[PDB]
Design a protein around this ligand. Structure first.
Ligand SMILES: O=C(O)C1CCNCC1
Ligand SMILES: [Cl-]
Ligand SMILES: [Mn+2]
Ligand SMILES: [Zn+2]
Ligand SMILES: [Zn+2]
Length: 454
């Protein structure tokens, strides 16, 4: 009645042995955790990274949040110090319940959250912080520079230090040269009671890993990747405004929605309370949302393993159908790894090889199709030198890299090879095929990968 909590997600407690390598561990739990979308990881008892900062010298500009179910909010984007925010947050919670701030049971904040977001008479607003690390506000993990204490140095090179996570070698987003600060740098979240993150999946269907440094718990709802489209159909029916096309990546619309609504429509949902010192991991295309119990501080980062590579290609195809902007070119990333085949991990090399073989076979078919449409002229073109906004398909907005069609009639404009009929009204003999590599360039790049993989 009123609120029925979803069943709990899996909780893992690895030994020091299992915990040593994050990628081997995540691959171990994957068959379990991918069935629930999220999972929680409790580190070994002595793994305790030092948190230290001056609460007075850390400044940030907060976002204001209206808490209404099914109401549209924008995904990304006054002045508080950590101390002044903390004082505002604690007084807010304390006055809301007329209780000392942690005699308030977690079960009660949860059912109160879902009551207040559904009730139209209530117009509660709250605030929070969301930002990547900078000089005014940096990582909660130790980083290099300032002399460090011997304990900080122990955790400088930890796999679970989230600054290191992207640039490790079993990560694929590693050697991407193109800037993607949005999804390779860690984000910092300063929470208060009821501040919340709307339902979403990560860019390019990547994993994420989330660490709560300190403070009151963070409550999570997660849906497995196989049910992503079920959830979207439920949401399209109850709030179609979120699904109208939007002009860019800075205009993605998201919302709050009761898990019981999803469970009623046969969408599997799981929950957890994440406490300080614990990790939450989200899997590819796993929807998630949640809210904070009180004043707290969390840090999160995207990442991509070799397991993810095929899904990443399916995702870009899915973006094309929806006319959504990409954050980077998936093909450009494959070719960059191929060109560095000699210094790649051998498991990586083998998995890149398989994706590249698919890429090449698809590119062959596409070029044959545009040739039969009467496009004859062609010229090599270094797509990776163009700013992203200068190489999106006019029709489907995909970021071009392997090839595109241009016409002297519309200078600067491009379409991908799926949308040759959408560029202009000139006859096809006036078009040029622009390509990064000939098929003959590509087969030796793939062979280099096969040799490295043996
Ligand atoms: O505020 C937060 O904790 C989150 C935001 C986005 N994804 C997951 C968690
Ligand atoms: Cl409300
Ligand atoms: Mn997220
Ligand atoms: Zn033309
Ligand atoms: Zn296109």
């Amino acid at each position: 009645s009123m609120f029925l909590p979803p069943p709990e997600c899996p909780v893992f407690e690895p030994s020091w042995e299992e915990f040593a390598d994050p990628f081997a561990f995540i691959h171990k739990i994957r068959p379990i955790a991918e069935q629930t979308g999220i999972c929680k990881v409790r580190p070994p008892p002595d793994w305790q990274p030092p948190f230290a900062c001056d609460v007075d010298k850390l400044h940030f500009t907060p976002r204001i949040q209206r808490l209404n179910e099914l109401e549209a909010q924008t995904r990304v984007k006054r002045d508080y110090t950590l101390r002044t925010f903390g004082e505002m947050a604690d007084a807010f919670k304390s006055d809301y319940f007329n209780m000392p701030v942690h005699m308030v049971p977690t079960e009660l904040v949860e059912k109160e959250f879902w009551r207040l977001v559904s009730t139209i008479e209530e117009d509660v607003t709250v605030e929070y912080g969301a930002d990547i690390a900078s000089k005014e506000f940096g990582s909660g993990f130790p980083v290099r520079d300032i002399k460090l204490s011997p304990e900080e140095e122990e955790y400088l090179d930890s796999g679970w230090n989230l600054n290191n996570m992207p640039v490790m070698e079993q990560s694929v987003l590693a050697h991407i040269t193109a800037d993607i600060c949005g999804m390779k740098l860690p984000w910092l979240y300063v929470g208060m009671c009821f501040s919340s993150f709307c339902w979403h999946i990560e860019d390019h269907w990547s994993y994420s890993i989330n660490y709560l440094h300190w403070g009151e718990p963070k409550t999570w709802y997660g849906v497995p990747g196989y049910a992503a489209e079920q959830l979207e159909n439920v949401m399209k029916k109850l709030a179609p405004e979120l699904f109208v096309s939007q002009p860019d990546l800075l205009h993605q619309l998201v919302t709050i929605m009761n898990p019981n609504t999803l469970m009623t429509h046969e969408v599997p949902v799981y929950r957890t309370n994440q406490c300080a010192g614990e990790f939450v991991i989200t899997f590819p295309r796993a929807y998630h949302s949640g809210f904070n119990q009180g004043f707290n501080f969390a840090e999160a980062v995207n990442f991509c393993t070799v397991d993810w590579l095929p899904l990443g290609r399916q995702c870009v195809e899915h973006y094309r159908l929806l006319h959504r902007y990409c954050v980077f070119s998936h093909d450009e990333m494959i070719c960059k790894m191929a060109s560095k085949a000699d210094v790649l991990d051998v498991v990586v090399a083998s998995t890149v090889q398989k994706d590249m073989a698919i890429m090449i076979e698809d590119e062959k078919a596409l070029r044959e199709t545009v040739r039969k449409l009467g496009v004859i002229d062609s010229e090599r073109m270094d797509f990776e030198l163009l700013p992203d906004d200068e190489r999106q398909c006019v029709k489907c907005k995909t970021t071009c890299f392997m090839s595109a069609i241009s016409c002297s009639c519309k200078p600067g404009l491009l379409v991908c090879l799926h949308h040759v009929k959408e560029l202009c009204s000139c006859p096809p003999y006036k078009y040029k095929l622009r390509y990064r590599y000939t098929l003959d360039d590509l087969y030796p790049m793939m062979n280099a990968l096969k040799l490295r993989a043996e």
